[PDB]
Amino acid sequence: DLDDVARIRLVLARELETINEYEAYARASSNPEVRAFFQHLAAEEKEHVSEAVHMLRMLDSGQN
Amino acid sequence: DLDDVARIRLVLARELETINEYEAYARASSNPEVRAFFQHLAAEEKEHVSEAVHMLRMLDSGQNDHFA
Amino acid sequence: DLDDVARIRLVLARELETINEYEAYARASSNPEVRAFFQHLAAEEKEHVSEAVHMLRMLDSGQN
Amino acid sequence: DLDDVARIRLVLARELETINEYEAYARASSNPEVRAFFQHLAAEEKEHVSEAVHMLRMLDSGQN
Amino acid sequence: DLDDVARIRLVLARELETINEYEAYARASSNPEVRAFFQHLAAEEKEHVSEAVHMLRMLDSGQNDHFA
Amino acid sequence: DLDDVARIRLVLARELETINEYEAYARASSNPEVRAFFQHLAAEEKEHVSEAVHMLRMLDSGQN
Amino acid sequence: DDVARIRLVLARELETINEYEAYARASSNPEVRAFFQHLAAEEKEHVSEAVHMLRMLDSGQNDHF
Amino acid sequence: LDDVARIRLVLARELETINEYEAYARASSNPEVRAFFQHLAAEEKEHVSEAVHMLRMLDSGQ
Amino acid sequence: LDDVARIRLVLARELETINEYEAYARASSNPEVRAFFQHLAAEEKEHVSEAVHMLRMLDSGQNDH
Amino acid sequence: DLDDVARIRLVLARELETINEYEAYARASSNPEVRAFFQHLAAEEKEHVSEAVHMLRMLDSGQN
Ligand SMILES: [Ca+2]
Ligand SMILES: [Ca+2]
Ligand SMILES: [Ca+2]
Ligand SMILES: [Ca+2]
Ligand SMILES: [Ca+2]
Ligand SMILES: [Ca+2]
Ligand SMILES: [Ca+2]
Ligand SMILES: [Ca+2]
Ligand SMILES: [Ca+2]
Ligand SMILES: [Fe+3]
Ligand SMILES: [Fe+3]
Ligand SMILES: [Fe+3]
Ligand SMILES: [Fe+3]
Ligand SMILES: [Fe+3]
Ligand SMILES: [Fe+3]
Ligand SMILES: [Fe+3]
Ligand SMILES: [Fe+3]
Ligand SMILES: [Fe+3]
Ligand SMILES: [Fe+3]
Ligand SMILES: [Fe+3]
Ligand SMILES: [Fe+3]
Ligand SMILES: [Fe+3]
Ligand SMILES: [Fe+3]
Ligand SMILES: [Fe+3]
Ligand SMILES: [Fe+3]
Numbered sequence: 001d002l003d004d005v006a007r008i009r010l011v012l013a014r015e016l017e018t019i020n021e022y023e024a025y026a027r028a029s030s031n032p033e034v035r036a037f038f039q040h041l042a043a044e045e046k047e048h049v050s051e052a053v054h055m056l057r058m059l060d061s062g063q064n
Numbered sequence: 065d066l067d068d069v070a071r072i073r074l075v076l077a078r079e080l081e082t083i084n085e086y087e088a089y090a091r092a093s094s095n096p097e098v099r100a101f102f103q104h105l106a107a108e109e110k111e112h113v114s115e116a117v118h119m120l121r122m123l124d125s126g127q128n129d130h131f132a
Numbered sequence: 133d134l135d136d137v138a139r140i141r142l143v144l145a146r147e148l149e150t151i152n153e154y155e156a157y158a159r160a161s162s163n164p165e166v167r168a169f170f171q172h173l174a175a176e177e178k179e180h181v182s183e184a185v186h187m188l189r190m191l192d193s194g195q196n
Numbered sequence: 197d198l199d200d201v202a203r204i205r206l207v208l209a210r211e212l213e214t215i216n217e218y219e220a221y222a223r224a225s226s227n228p229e230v231r232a233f234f235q236h237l238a239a240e241e242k243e244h245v246s247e248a249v250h251m252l253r254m255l256d257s258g259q260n
Numbered sequence: 261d262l263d264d265v266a267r268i269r270l271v272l273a274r275e276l277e278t279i280n281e282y283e284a285y286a287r288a289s290s291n292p293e294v295r296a297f298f299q300h301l302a303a304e305e306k307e308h309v310s311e312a313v314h315m316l317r318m319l320d321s322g323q324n325d326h327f328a
Numbered sequence: 329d330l331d332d333v334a335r336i337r338l339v340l341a342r343e344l345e346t347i348n349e350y351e352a353y354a355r356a357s358s359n360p361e362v363r364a365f366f367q368h369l370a371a372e373e374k375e376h377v378s379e380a381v382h383m384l385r386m387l388d389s390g391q392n
Numbered sequence: 393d394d395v396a397r398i399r400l401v402l403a404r405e406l407e408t409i410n411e412y413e414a415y416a417r418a419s420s421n422p423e424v425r426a427f428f429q430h431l432a433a434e435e436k437e438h439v440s441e442a443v444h445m446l447r448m449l450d451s452g453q454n455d456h457f
Numbered sequence: 458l459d460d461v462a463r464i465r466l467v468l469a470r471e472l473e474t475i476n477e478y479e480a481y482a483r484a485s486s487n488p489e490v491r492a493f494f495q496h497l498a499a500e501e502k503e504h505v506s507e508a509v510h511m512l513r514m515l516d517s518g519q
Numbered sequence: 520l521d522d523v524a525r526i527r528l529v530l531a532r533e534l535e536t537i538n539e540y541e542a543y544a545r546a547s548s549n550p551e552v553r554a555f556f557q558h559l560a561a562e563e564k565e566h567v568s569e570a571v572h573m574l575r576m577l578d579s580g581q582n583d584h
Numbered sequence: 585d586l587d588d589v590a591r592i593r594l595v596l597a598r599e600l601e602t603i604n605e606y607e608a609y610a611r612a613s614s615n616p617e618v619r620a621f622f623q624h625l626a627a628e629e630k631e632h633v634s635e636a637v638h639m640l641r642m643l644d645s646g647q648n
Contacts, residue, residue, distance in 0.1 A: 133220065133223070138219070138220075141212040141213070141215060142213070142216065143213055144208075144209070145208070145209035145210075145212045145213055146209075148205040148208055148209040148260075149205070149209055151205060151239050152198070152202045152205050152206065152260065155199075155201075155202065156197065157203070159197070160197075160204070160259070161237070167198075167222070171221075174258070175258055177260075178258040178260035179258065179260075181260040182259065182260060185229075185249055187224045192242070194238075194239060194242045194245075195242055195245075195246050196212075196215065196241075196242035196245040196246060
C-alpha cells in the first residue's frame, strides 16, 4: 500500500545507496578510466538525488 | 571502508524508509491514538531527514552543486 | 495479517536497530560535528523507544 | 563492532518480532492446543521483553 | 501454505537460531551481568526447544517414529 | 563466531525448514511418483532431525 | 576486480530501471509518472555507458558484442 | 512452478546442504561432531543421486 | 570452499536459473521473448549436464551415488 | 508488475552476476581442470549476455 510520495522516498533511498557504491568502487579501482567512470556515474546520481528531493518537496507537506 | 558522507547517506536512506513505514502504519491503524502516535513519529522522522540533507549538503560539495 | 500491537512491536524493533546504527556511526565517525549529529539522532530515537514501550504496555495487558 | 547495550537492543528487537510470529501462528492455527502452545510461548517471550527493556534502561544512560 | 506441524517446525528452527545468538552474545559481552543475562535467556530458550520437540513428535507421527 | 553445538543447531533448523519444503511440494504435486519421491525425502529428513536432536542432547547439558 | 564491479553496477542499474518503470505505471499523479519515466530514461543512458565500458574492458564480452 | 521445478529446487538446496555439512565438518573441534557432519554429508549425496534420477526421468531436455 | 563445493554451487545456481527461465517463458507475452527464454533454458540444461559430469569426476563419494 | 522487458533486464542482471561468480571460482580453484571448466562457463555466459542485450535494445526504444 504505497502512494506516490512513498515511491519517491524509496527511489531517493536507493539513489543514496547507489552513490555510496559508485564512490566505493571508484576508490577501490586503480585504473584511472574506471575510477573516472565511477566518479562520473556518482555525480549524475547526485543529480538524481536533487531531483527526487525537489519532487518530495513539491508533494510532501510535512517535508517542505 | 566507509566515510562520513557514506554514513550520512545511509542514515538518510534508512530514515526515508522509516517514514514510509510510519505513514503506512498510521493509515492501517484503527486506534486513533496509535494513529496519532505513528503520525507523530513520521513527522519527527521528516524533521530528521531535513537535518540529514543539510549535513549531506555541507559535506558533499558536488551534491550541493546539484542544488540538493 | 497485522494488528496495532504487532505494528508497534515492529516499530520498536526497528527503532532499536536504528539506535545501534547511529551509535556505531558515531563511534566510527572522524568528524566531531558528524559524531555529534549521530549522537543527537540516537538520543531522540531513544525518546521514541520509551514512548513505543509505553504504548505497547497500554495495548498488550501481557505488557509486551 | 558491537557493545553490550547494542547486543541487548538486538535481542530485544528479535524478541519483539518473535512475539509477532507466535501470536500470528496462534491465530492461524486450527488445532486449539497448538493455539495454546503458541500463546504460552508468546507469554514467556513477553516476559523476556520485559527483562530486556529493564536491562537496557539500567545500562543505557539515555534510558531508552 | 502451512499447517500446524509446519508452523511448529518454523518455531523450533527460530528458537535454535535464537539460542545460538544468546550464547554468542554471552561469550562476547564484557559486563559479567550482561553476560549472565544472556546465559539465562539461553537456558530458557533451551526449555522452549524441549517443549517444541515434544509438540512436534506428538503431532508428527513419522517424526516420532524416528524418535526425537 | 560459532562453536560445535551452534553448528548442530543450525543444521537442525535447516533440516526442519527442509521438511517443511518437502511436505509442501508433496502436497502441491498431483503426479503420484513425484508425491512419493517428496514424501520419501521428508521421511529421511525426519531421520536427520532425530539424529541432530540426539547430538544436541549429548553435547548441550542445558538442553539435555 | 574492475570488470566485476562494472558488471555489478550494470546489474544494479537494470534493476533500478525496472523499479522506475513499475513506479511510473503505479503512480496516480501524472507528474509523478512523468518523473519516474524521466528517471528511467536517464538510467537507460547509464546502462549504455556501462555496457560500453564492459565491452572495452572485457574482450571476451566484446567478442560476441 | 511445476514438478520439474520443485525437483530442481530440491536438488539445488541439497547441493548447498552438502557444502554446509562439509564446511561444518572442517570447522568443527570435536571429532565426533566432525564425523556426524561427514555422515550427514554422505546421506545428502545419496539424496542428490536420487533427485538427479528423478529430474532426468521427467525432463527429456535434461 | 573447495573445488567440489564450487562445482556444487554453480550447479545449484544453474538449476535455479533454469527455473527462472522457464517461469519467465511462461509469463511472457511476446512470442520471441518466450522463445528467447526457452532457448536460454535449453542451453542452461546443457551447462547442468557438464556440471554434473564434473562433480562426479571430482567427488568419488558422489560418483558412488 | 513485470512486463517482458523487465524480465529481460532481470535475466541480464543475473547472467552478469553469474559471470562474476564463474571468474571468481576460476581464480579461487586449485585444479586447472576446474579452472578451465569455470572459464568455459564464463565464456558461454558472456554469449548469453550479448543475446540479452540485443533483445533489450530491440524491446526497449530508450536503450540507445
Ligand atoms: Ca539508484
Ligand atoms: Ca527507526
Ligand atoms: Ca526471540
Ligand atoms: Ca526465538
Ligand atoms: Ca536439509
Ligand atoms: Ca542504480
Ligand atoms: Ca537440503
Ligand atoms: Ca546460472
Ligand atoms: Ca545465469
Ligand atoms: Fe538513478
Ligand atoms: Fe546510476
Ligand atoms: Fe536530469
Ligand atoms: Fe532517525
Ligand atoms: Fe529533531
Ligand atoms: Fe523513531
Ligand atoms: Fe527469547
Ligand atoms: Fe522463543
Ligand atoms: Fe531470564
Ligand atoms: Fe536419511
Ligand atoms: Fe539433510
Ligand atoms: Fe543415518
Ligand atoms: Fe534432503
Ligand atoms: Fe546456458
Ligand atoms: Fe544462463
Ligand atoms: Fe550458466
